[PDB]
Design a protein around this nucleic acid. Sequence first.
RNA 1: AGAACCUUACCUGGUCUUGACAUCCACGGAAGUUUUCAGAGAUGAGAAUGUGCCUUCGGGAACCGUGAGACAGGUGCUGCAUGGCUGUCGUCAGCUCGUGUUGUGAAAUGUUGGGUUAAGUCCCGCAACGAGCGCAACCCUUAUCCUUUGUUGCCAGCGGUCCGGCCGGGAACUCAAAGGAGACUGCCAGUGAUAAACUGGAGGAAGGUGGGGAUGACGUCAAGUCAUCAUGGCCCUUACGACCAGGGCUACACACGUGCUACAAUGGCGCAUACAAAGAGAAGCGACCUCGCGAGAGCAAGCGGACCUCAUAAAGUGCGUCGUAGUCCGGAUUGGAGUCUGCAACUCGACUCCAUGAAGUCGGAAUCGCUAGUAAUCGUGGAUCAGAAUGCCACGGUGAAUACGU
Lengths: 91, 103, 178, 100, 232, 129
Amino acid sequence: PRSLKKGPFIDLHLLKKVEKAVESGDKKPLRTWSRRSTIFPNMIGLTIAVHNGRQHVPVFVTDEMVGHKLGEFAPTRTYRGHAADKKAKKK
Amino acid sequence: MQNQRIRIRLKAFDHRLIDQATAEIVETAKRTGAQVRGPIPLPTRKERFTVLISPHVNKDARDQYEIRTHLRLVDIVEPTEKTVDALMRLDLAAGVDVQISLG
Amino acid sequence: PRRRVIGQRKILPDPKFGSELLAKFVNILMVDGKKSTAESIVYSALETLAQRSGKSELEAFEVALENVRPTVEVKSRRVGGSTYQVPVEVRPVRRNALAMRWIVEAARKRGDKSMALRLANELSDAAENKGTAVKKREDVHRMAEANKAFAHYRWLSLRSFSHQAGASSKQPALGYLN
Amino acid sequence: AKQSMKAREVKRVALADKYFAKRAELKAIISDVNASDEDRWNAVLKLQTLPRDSSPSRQRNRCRQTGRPHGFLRKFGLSRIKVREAAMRGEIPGLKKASW
Amino acid sequence: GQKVHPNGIRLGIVKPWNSTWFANTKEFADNLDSDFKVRQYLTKELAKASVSRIVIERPAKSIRVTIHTARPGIVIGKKGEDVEKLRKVVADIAGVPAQINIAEVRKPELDAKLVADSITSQLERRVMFRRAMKRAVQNAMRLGAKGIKVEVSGRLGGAEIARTEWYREGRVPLHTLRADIDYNTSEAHTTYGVIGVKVWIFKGEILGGMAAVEQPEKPAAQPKKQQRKGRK
Amino acid sequence: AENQYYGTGRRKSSAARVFIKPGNGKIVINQRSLEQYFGRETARMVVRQPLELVDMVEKLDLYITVKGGGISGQAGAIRHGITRALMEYDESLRSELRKAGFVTRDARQVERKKVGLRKARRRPQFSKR
RNA sequence: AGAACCUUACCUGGUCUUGACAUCCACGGAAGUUUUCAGAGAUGAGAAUGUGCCUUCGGGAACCGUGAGACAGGUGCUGCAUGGCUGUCGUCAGCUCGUGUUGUGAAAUGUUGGGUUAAGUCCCGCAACGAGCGCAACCCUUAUCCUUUGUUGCCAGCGGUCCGGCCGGGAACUCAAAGGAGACUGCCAGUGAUAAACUGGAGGAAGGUGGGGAUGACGUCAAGUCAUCAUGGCCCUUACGACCAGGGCUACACACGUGCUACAAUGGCGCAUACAAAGAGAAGCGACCUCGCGAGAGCAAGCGGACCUCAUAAAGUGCGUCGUAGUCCGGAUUGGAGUCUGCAACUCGACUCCAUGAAGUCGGAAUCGCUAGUAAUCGUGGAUCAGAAUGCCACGGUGAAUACGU
């Protein structure tokens, strides 16, 4: 297994996004480039739009996803299935 | 066996140049001191390189370059201060760097 | 091809007994370069053989190397629309090695609970001409009596031969106009 | 070849000294086992984002002459092709073709 | 287009290296890149002279330029201002202060880069090349040496095809390790693009211009050389 | 005549140094016993193998020094060092031992791992088409 | 030659246009460094340390932010538009320069024959004469071995003594870096047209240019690089430039090229047991140390590497043990915990290690290197090197069948 080693991360980018977001409880989805960032208690009930490189994809932040990174809910690679080859695109 | 009192070390890439530069230091030490030895060969280091031979592709043909590095030690069992004074004064080489520092 | 005559290596007696005929045996007993094991397998086999008959440890090895020995070989060299086979009588260095190969080729499938036993059983057996490589002999001489029919692009070779101080008849042997 | 990876490297070495010097020893002090119930406090390790391009993990340097990436050799400060042009003409001390 | 480069295997015996200094591994790249920068920017200044080689050498606390020339006076200029300006910039590039000497001039008409500047001038200047290859060869064999090869490329006459031509005469060894032997590949521009000449010239199979050291170890240095063999 | 005759025991670029003398049949290896140098090794019957061959177990006393190589091999050189050292009991001694191979050094010399090849001679494998 | 971002070309998202980087001008700031806050970071705004260089004492360069130009910049396009460079044939054993002669000339001749070879090597010989290129050689290396050194090298003997050169000491001895020695079909014999040369003899490590490397003809193939770089033609230059970030080739329906290790018992299991070479360690590694199952942790003498360390070198050996059952071979996966390089380990990073435990029993079509230190096989170190080697380079362990014949 892999880990986060030993130091403390809160991410600089989510600290400053979250501080302005919490004050209303919630507002419209926060435009996020931070795919490096873990999910945290401070972020519970926010809606984080996560750039995947092509576009932002909405991740709804909630208690069950705190063991995880923002970049896990938001996808990257495309899988061609083998019922039959993928004919179409998905955005 | 003996314990190393002091280290004088000669480092070069040209093998004839180092053999000549130690033999002359050895001469200076017998002429300008009393307690000298004949130069210890010491093992030679060699660094290994591999590169292409064409700009692009041709995996089979390849190139290998070598660079050799020669180490002489002398090991004068006692230098007089007057020996060390002549050594550093009559220095002028480029194929060899002579080291008199200790560590 | 080949401009001049080129030589062969010579095996120098092994380090744990002092025999050339054993140092050549251990060389084909080698798997993954490991002659220093193939030595350990020869001497451990030989000693099990030595309980079976005490007059020599080499008894059943030395007679195996005579009895399963092929005396004749069949060779192959394609001609056009045909492959054919052409018999030759074989040189002693390969007579000896074929038999050494065949004793060890049979041993590694004997399934016995130690390789020293596997090799010791196939030697006790091939010494009495009852074992696994009596068949390997039998076949290799059959081919050499059967393939006496064929020649190398024969119909034109048979005039070419007759003027080169050859016979009025098909020579069943390699690399001659026949 | 391209100028953009070489430009990246030129701008990076000034940002190594400017961002990175003050963070140099900071991994051992604030994070690892010496930061057992000492430091380990978020507010000084959110400050390593400025050094994020300046990070030891992008101190890959490549050719020193051109800034050109891939196939590098640290001992000359060159690469395969650029070592070869100078070895061919003897421009590098002690370096020759190999036989033994 | 074959062969590992002909002068490159010769670099360890009776051909000198183009540079000679030593840096103890960790500083060897920093010294190699400065050794290049002195090559590149110094030759820019002497553009108007004619020069066959550039040799850069680094003792303690010093950098020594050797330069090899078509004549001794060509780099000095009027009243040494010129050669001070050369040393000025060698001192600016290098982590040390600078010395410069002009070498003794020996076979400057048969030397690798100076014979090839003479031959490249004909193609550069777009002369017919009906007689050139023969007049190049006539003058190399009239001034000295034992054999020459010239190969000329860059689309002779202005061509829109690949177009090469060549000339060998006398003796030109290729797989030889002993003596210096002079090769140059020129690069030069004209109206239609880059042109280039590959020039092997062969002066002698024994040449004393770099030779092994005067003594072996065994006769050299101290008269009483035998050890005590212990006895501290 | 000298205090100990000496053999150079060359096999495969390893040197068995072997000082032979008259004594009571003994062996010394790297200033210790057989159990020390050749601990649980076949190497102990190796070093006995040249001493049996010329029928001299009970007549040579020996002092043996050896470096480099693999252990079964170090002994294999000592098997050459013991016959190397023997030359002078009689004038033919060296002629007969040279004819059997036990003075004769392993005339095969290393081939360097070669440029452009995966070994010394091993050229790439390609089907490429 | 060591793909999270970087790298990276590709694609998208923020943001400016002299611009990442140079000179030159305009305007604020010295650059360098430290610091709060907004902003994803870029960027921007403010703060404190410093206030250098020159001076029309205004103000500028330097360097940075801003702006405009000349201009910088382009993995921009074209490899029948190129230069520089290298690959194929092939170790083919041939190819060419100078010159004459024979034909009207294109072109022959030599460069073809007999004998022989690594060889245009060498005996014989014709219109081929004269001569060069490949090969042959010098060359480096190795092997003994001659030679000098005598340590961080060695130690028949001698001392403390675990019998380690650590040390009192000792030179019988490898041994290391360096001059290099020896081997030439020259000797002798058989063969071969005298003969090159093949084989045998003998001393020596070794007889067949001693082993190994260097080593590659003129040059078609229009082979391939505009992406090392030179560079004309020739296009953008608010960009076919630049900062910053994220994402990818490491995708999955699969096939294929290659290498690894395996499919056993020649082995593996447990316990005990042995010796390497070569090189890396100046920015770095590092004994002992105390913690830790290990990895690692945090401290650190010490180092300059023939002293210390990577590193327990493994395979191989000892003993007892195992039977085709995918096991007693093989150990992949995956769950889980400890650890690491870095703001940051999710797809795409490393390491230790606990438990369970598959495929595969030598495989169709396909398919390659090798003449002997080779092939095969086993481990090591290094080059690269943030973090990652099955690979490359070299090294040492152990080390094969045969080469009749064309």
